[PDB]
Amino acid sequence: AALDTLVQTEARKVMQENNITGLSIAITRHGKQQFYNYGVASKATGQPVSSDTLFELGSISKTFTATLATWAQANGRLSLTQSIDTYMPPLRDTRLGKIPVFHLGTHTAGGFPIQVPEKVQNTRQLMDYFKAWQPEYLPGTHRTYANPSIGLLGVIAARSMNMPFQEAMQQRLFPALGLNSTYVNVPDDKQTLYAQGYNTLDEPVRVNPGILAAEAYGVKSSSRDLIRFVEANIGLGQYDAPLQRALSDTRIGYFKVGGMTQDLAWEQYPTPIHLDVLLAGNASAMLNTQKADAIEPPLAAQPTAWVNKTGSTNGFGGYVAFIAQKQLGIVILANKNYPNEERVKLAYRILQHAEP
Template sequence: MKRKAACLATTIFMTLTATSPASHATGEPPARIRQTVDAVVRPIMTKNRIAGMAVGVVADGKPYVFNYGVASRATGRPVTANTLFELGSVSKTLTATLVSYAQASGRLSLSDKTGQYLPALRGHPFGEVPLVDLGTHTPGGLPLQVPDDIHDNAQLMRYLGAWRPTHAPGTYRTYSNISIGTLGLITAKSFGQDFATLMQGRLFPALGMTHTYINVPQAKMADYAQGYTKAGAPIRMAPGVLAAEAYGVKSTASDMLRFVRANMAMVPLEGKLQRAVLATHTGYFKAGPMTQDLIWEQYPYPVPLQSLLDGNSAAMVLHGAPVAPITPPQAPSAHAWINKTGSTNGFGAYVAFIPQKRMGIVILANKNFPMEERVSAAYRILTALAGDAR
């Protein structure tokens, strides 16, 4: 009976709504945008039994948010403009923004060696890794996850001290939470603050992201969506070493759309921060079909869907690949599809934007559904709307 009630609640709240927070969105969306997003998202939710989704679209520079379903099957609470989703590895793009801001502020340089900031690693191979390699998954071979037996930063430093590269830094890409997570630690240290405090107290407010958190305040817990495993069991992310730095951000579709627009220089930011945001689009390595930026991944636009599927495939995450350094690094380009995927055990996310077209998309769901479906959905929506962008 409870399951029937939950399904009924999902059906009731599957009705599409477009939200327009004063600072983030622009009135009622044109019918074509609403219909295009609806036609793509509804079948995905049904096929994957997703309880709730929020999809944000920037079309012709204007942001629109569409909410579907429920944030919690147990309560039937609908997804709203205030619903918080776990971003998973999309969080890394915000960490990269802080790193870039630290460099613009003279607190570090991406050419610096890791050991300059982590004295315990001086004289060890990890201490010789340039910071840029930590931000591009190219330090020389690290696992995807922090090992289960590491429970604090002291144990992490011992692990990194014993680490031995399987490839020379800057020659091989192995996607890893450890590399960008350690870079996040270093960046916070360069500011003399705790990472979560720095992000929540400085970066998020400076970006105008007023509903974005690493540690969700008690007063906002009612807005935190319930995640669901592939089997449908309720789950949320657990704390862990480097979780905050690598995959720990929770945000709304509206806030993430603001971040997308900031990445296309469409919102007013302090000059140094704006330069830092755009600098994260600098290309450092060619890896398969894509160019590896500071966490962001980009493709020359227009781009075939298959290239996006290949670049965002499980193989690119789970298996290493040789890279070709770009010397000098590739300057940020407006003629690019720039993207990042993100997942936790109970949430799935995808963000992409095309600066030259003044278009972008944010897909947030309270279930981890296949990456190729997220990428294909974004591609279908943006391709269909490209005629609306001028």
């Protein structure tokens, strides 16, 4: 009741300050899940937000892409230490092709723009772009957040599984994890649950098709599913060895970037966890190219670390944070792209008081 009164106060304050129409929060504490829903999914329908409302995940999608890769790896189909041209023939004898696959999940392969160039409008043109790519820095010396490199990780993983990326996600990975309402492509009868996004002028919008969109920012999910994905990463679920390893392997620490440790798509912060450090590592300035220091050997999954990922599209803003050792996790999903800093503060405030 106290925790429920706190969540409601913090939730309402952030919605007031950032003009959020709908908000869905889920928390898990030692397997116990609780759900907090506010506002509406659409101003037009007036439908209330619930734990089964679908939101656009934006870059939280990348954590599923990365889990696809390590699952491939845990089934003998993809060793992430191998060069890109081991598992992507069209990049044989290229600069990118020589670089190990893991740099695509860690954002350290050599410099990319955050979006796939507008001149790329089909798969042939995407291949030619990767063929014509030249690095600005050596692999692992700097970190540059980017959909091109992440999206290529997804392509590689699905090619190792002999199927299209959407099929690898929707017919293999998501059901294997027990995610029954998580989608790249939302089918017709689920269309009724898909929240409306609201943009910078508070106008309705949903994310569009784009090259590598599926692979980098195109997953839609409910808070009920996403907190299940958080629980899998905490170490609940009792999946079979390869999937359990896949989950754990995404949270290996490969690089130090200022105060943050860079994993496979996940980012994390070791103890003592302070808000100031979380706010710094989640700021918009972190998208710029940063100096990075390799961790060799890479750090095993750290139970005590705060693991997180921000996710955004033009209409949506999401945030996932969890600590495996305290079996403490949170998902915050909104139909507004509001400041990352408010998302982090909201999570920090709730998890501070969730744990006795």
